[PDB]
A paper describes a structure:
In contrast to the multiple CCD paralogs found in vertebrates, most insect genomes encode a single CCD known as Neither Inactivation Nor Afterpotential B (NinaB). Later studies demonstrated that NinaB not only cleaves carotenoids symmetrically but also isomerizes one-half of its substrate to form a ~1:1 mixture of 11-cis and all-trans RAL products. This enzyme was thus termed an isomerooxygenase. In NinaB, similar to other oxygenase members of the CCD superfamily, the ferrous iron cofactor activates dioxygen for reaction with a target alkene bond within the substrate.
To bridge this gap in understanding, we report a high-resolution crystal structure of NinaB from the cabbage looper (Trichoplusia ni), revealing the molecular architecture of its active site and details of its membrane-interacting structural elements. The structure was solved by molecular replacement in space group C2, revealing an asymmetric unit composed of eight copies of TnNinaB. TnNinaB adopts the classical seven-bladed β-propeller CCD fold with its iron cofactor coordinated at the propeller axis. The NinaB iron center is coordinated by four conserved His residues and contains an additional solvent molecule bound trans to His184. The iron center abuts an extended pocket, ~30 Å in length, that runs along the top face of the β-propeller forming the substrate-binding cleft of the enzyme. As compared with the apocarotenoid-cleaving enzyme NdCCD, the proximal active site size of NinaB is much larger owing to the need to accommodate passage of a β-ionone or 3-hydroxy-β-ionone ring during substrate binding. Other noteworthy features of the active site include the observation of multiple rotamers for Trp17 and Met339, both located in the distal active site, as well as the presence of 2-methyl-2,4-pentanediol (MPD) derived from the crystallization precipitant, which inhibits TnNinaB activity toward zeaxanthin with an half-maximum inhibitory concentration (IC50) value of 0.67% v/v. In the TnNinaB crystal structure, three of the protomers in the asymmetric unit (chains B, F and H) exhibited well-defined density for the entire region while three others had partially resolved sequences (chains D, E and G). Residues 118–126 form a variable-length α-helical structure with pronounced amphipathicity. In both cases, 11-cis isomer production was nearly abolished despite robust oxygenase activity as evidenced by WT-level formation of the all-trans isomer product. Mapping Trp17, Phe357 and the other residues impacting 11-cis formation within the TnNinaB active site revealed their clustering within the distal region of the active site pocket.
Numbering used by the authors: 5 to 111, 132 to 507
The structure:
């Protein structure tokens, strides 16, 4: 009758928005918002498990729900609107699940629920299939879609492209070249006058370790001189995926875990586009690389690591529903931030040094991205990933130099991925604020807030709180657009 994880309400993930907030909701302000903070926080995430009388069976299948916090002069409004995807249209028309999903068989999907990223002045919602959807940054209307297979011959891609200071976008994905799978880096070059998608081209590539079992990757790294590919022993079975698509099996069965093999860190030259170096580390699974950089002949790769890929199994609806009696659930979610380090001049297949960055589980990490991505940095921000923590909704700041942590948490409160915004006359790396979207657990399922933390102290500066007309689903990733 009793809970193994009494301080954790996993059912914050199991909500369906029943009514869109199309018109801006006025927010109840507490504390003191920074007056200088002006712009739009966009969020994306799962937002509907229901499809007529049917129900999705995995969280990754849940319908993409966009969120908008408009911030100006200490006032904040809230909106949320479903992304108008092909999958949503087809499922709603049929009033049932007619598209095969990651975790659900139909009775490829374009449910771009993972993230939102800027391509110049435009913003696109992503999943890892090749179709992305443009989003109106004011109204959350779904505008045109783009097909990355048509655009640059990507059959799939990560939902976490890298955005350069000059506006250029890089992303990694799979491409079939002369009947063979290759991992490729696509570049979407920014110019005011041009079209980033029209001028998109492949700038690097890499052969998979196993020709018909290419490695899955959710993120990739970039340094001054290299694209960094972390090739983990979780693979997509080409024939498996084809089979499941034909026979209408959930596509998750396409993933294969091979723990007898190690993880490789592969550097592709930004100059030549070819693999130039490769190193080894332990068998691990990862989703989010924190940052990569070169410093005085050393390569640094910071990422949030698991021992295996069981976190995927943890996010089945049934697994979430029954987690309070699951003795292994916390271990499935057991992530640890690690620094992988090696000399750039070291021989090929040298083992990397692997160090823990902090003695606390971290996920959905962010940094002072605009100034520190691909470069030396000191601080990252994340959310606690320990299911069995005293408070599993902790916002964490890690000082990578010292190992010092600073935290913010409140009872029954579940903050999102924190996004860093620098202060107007910023001197230091952590001279700014964190924006986080809050939901609450238990029966407090129709309240959302924008939290603003002081990045130096991790103290709450201010908060805007909203009530939604229907259940408020928990989001995944976002982006801040300054005015
Ligand atoms: Cl607390
Ligand atoms: Fe992600």
């Amino acid at each position: 009758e009793e809970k193994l994880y009494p301080n954790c309400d996993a059912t914050v993930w199991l909500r369906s928005c029943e009514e869109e907030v199309s018109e801006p909701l006025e927010g109840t302000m507490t504390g003191e918002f920074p007056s200088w903070l002006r712009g739009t926080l966009l969020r994306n995430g799962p937002g509907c498990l229901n499809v007529g009388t049917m129900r999705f069976e995995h969280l990754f299948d849940s319908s993409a729900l966009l969120h908008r916090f408009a911030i100006d002069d200490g006032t904040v409004t809230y909106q949320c609107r479903f992304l108008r995807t092909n999958t949503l249209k087809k499922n709603r028309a049929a009033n049932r699940i007619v598209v095969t999903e990651f975790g659900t068989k139909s009775a490829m999907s374009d449910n771009a629920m993972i993230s939102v990223y800027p391509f110049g002045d435009e913003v696109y919602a992503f999943t890892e299939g090749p179709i992305i959807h443009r989003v109106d940054t004011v109204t959350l209307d779904t505008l045109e879609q783009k097909n990355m297979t048509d655009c640059v011959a990507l059959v799939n891609h990560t939902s976490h492209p890298h955005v350069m200071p000059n506006g250029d976008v890089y992303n990694v994905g799979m491409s079939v070249v002369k009947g063979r799978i290759r991992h490729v880096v696509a570049k979407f070059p920014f110019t005011e006058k041009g079209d980033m998608f029209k001028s998109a081209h492949i700038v690097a590539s890499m052969a998979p370790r196993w020709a018909l079992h290419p490695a899955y990757m959710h993120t990739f790294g970039i340094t001054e001189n290299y694209f960094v590919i972390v090739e983990q022993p979780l693979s997509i079975s080409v024939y498996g995926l084809m089979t499941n698509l034909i026979n209408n099996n959930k596509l998750a069965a396409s993933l294969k875990w091979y723990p007898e093999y190690e993880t490789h860190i592969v550097l592709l030259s930004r100059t030549t586009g070819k693999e130039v170096k490769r190193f080894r580390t332990d068998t691990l699974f990862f989703l989010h690389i924190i940052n990569c950089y070169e410093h005085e002949g050393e390569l640094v790769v910071d990422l949030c690591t698991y021992k295996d890929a069981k976190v995927v199994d943890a996010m089945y609806v049934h697994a979430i529903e029954t987690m309070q009696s699951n003795a292994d659930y916390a271990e499935w979610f057991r992530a640890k931030p690690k620094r992988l380090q090696v000399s750039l001049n070291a021989p090929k297949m040298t083992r990397m040094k692997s160090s823990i960055l902090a003695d606390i589980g971290c996920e959905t990490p962010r940094i002072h991205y605009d100034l520190h991505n691909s470069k030396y940095y000191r601080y990252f921000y994340a959310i606690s990933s320990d299911v069995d923590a005293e408070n599993p909704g902790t916002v964490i700041k890690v000082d990578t130099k010292t190992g010092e942590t600073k935290t913010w948490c409140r009872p029954n409160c579940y903050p999102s991925e924190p996004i860093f915004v620098p202060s107007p006359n910023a001197k230091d790396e952590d001279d700014g604020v964190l924006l986080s979207a809050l939901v609450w657990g238990g029966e407090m399922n129709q309240t959302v807030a924008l939290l603003v933390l002081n990045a130096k102290t991790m103290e709450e500066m201010g908060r805007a709180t909203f009530n939604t007309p229907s259940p408020a689903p928990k989001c995944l990733h976002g982006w801040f657009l300054p005015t």
